[PDB]
Write a protein that binds this ligand. Structure first.
Ligand SMILES: CCc1nc(C)oc1C(=O)Nc1nc2cc(C(N)=O)cnc2n1C/C=C/Cn1c(NC(=O)c2oc(C)nc2CC)nc2cc(C(N)=O)cc(OCCCO)c21
Lengths: 173, 173
């Protein structure tokens, strides 16, 4: 019923609690060897549940730089540069919360019992649950940040790059 | 609340519907190049939710042979030989339904709201939901089999190898 609760816990249990303890060392290794990449995993949480199929960002101000190197479990995490009026303004490890894509897909399948008009409610519950987990989680040692956003309801202009930079600059301050 | 419903759908959406369409070709490639391996993914569903941490089977009659070869998404799937009274009796691709491990872990976390005594009920619901999904799923073209089992309640002897062989021999017949 409250499907997003279980998905948040699973996402923590089966992914975040495994990848997050080794992230800082992977980033410090990249910053030593291969314009420093910021220390946290930035997790994009579009409340419209729109995650591109290729996991690629359409915003040309969010430009793919490189894969993080590894620490039988291969983790593909991407480093992006954030541009603002033509200028490199930040560099971070960025990815979508893929369980939101699962909410979207469930809403499309007749036998999932997941109404199309419940995506927003479930997305918000996913965000709330995940933020509550991360607040009491030992593997989160200042190494992920949740970026939840809804684009304007009138379909006015939205900048995902500006959304991310606001969060990065809060961590600067 | 009915947490296992969402986990079954996620397991289908984010794993089974991606890996199952390419499985037959990976197996046929193995059977050509590298005692033929059976055609289906055998998915172990222990209703006690006991999935080993290393994903390794304690039963010495289930003996690791090899990894399936690949078809930025690396899938590690293991081929096992099934022994019966010292004899190679079958060969298949075998793995645990890892969302059952997630049910177990949720039951241990105070803030998950998942009672310890609800594991069996949720495991059964996971199995029921997953079997219902797979019955109407286009990517399941006769290429996975669910093996759900509960060991005797009095802690008498249980053979996981015999459990798997029964299913393999039904596919022979
Ligand atoms: C499984 C934890 C989970 N819970 C929810 C609701 O969301 C997730 C989540 O997002 N996890 C996840 N995200 C990742 C990103 C990367 C990365 N960026 O590299 C790498 N790994 C990630 N992972 C762990 C697994 C993902 C899919 N996957 C599953 N999935 C489930 O078990 C599962 O259970 C439930 C309830 N839902 C799911 C699907 C998400 N089993 C797999 C077995 C093998 C294998 N045999 O090797 C390989 C697999 O994937 C390889 C390609 C990865 O892109 C497997």
């Amino acid at each position: 019923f409250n499907v997003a609760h279980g998905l948040a816990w699973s996402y923590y249990i089966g992914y975040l609690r495994l990848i997050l303890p080794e992230l800082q060392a992977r980033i410090r290794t990249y910053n030593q060897h291969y314009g420093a990449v910021s220390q946290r995993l930035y997790i994009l949480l579009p409340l419209d549940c729109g995650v591109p199929d290729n996991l690629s960002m359409a915003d040309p101000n969010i430009r793919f730089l490189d894969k993080l190197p590894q620490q039988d479990r291969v983790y593909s995490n991407s480093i992006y540069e954030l541009l603002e009026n033509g200028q490199r303004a930040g560099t971070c490890v960025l990815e979508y919360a893929t369980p939101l894509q699962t909410l979207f897909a469930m809403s499309q399948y007749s036998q999932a019992g997941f109404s199309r008009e419940d995506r927003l409610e479930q997305a918000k519950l996913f965000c709330r649950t995940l933020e509550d987990i991360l607040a009491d989680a030992p593997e989160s040692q200042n190494n992920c940040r949740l970026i939840a956003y809804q684009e304007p309801a009138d379909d006015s202009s939205f900048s995902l790059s500006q959304e991310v930079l606001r969060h990065l600059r809060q961590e600067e301050k």
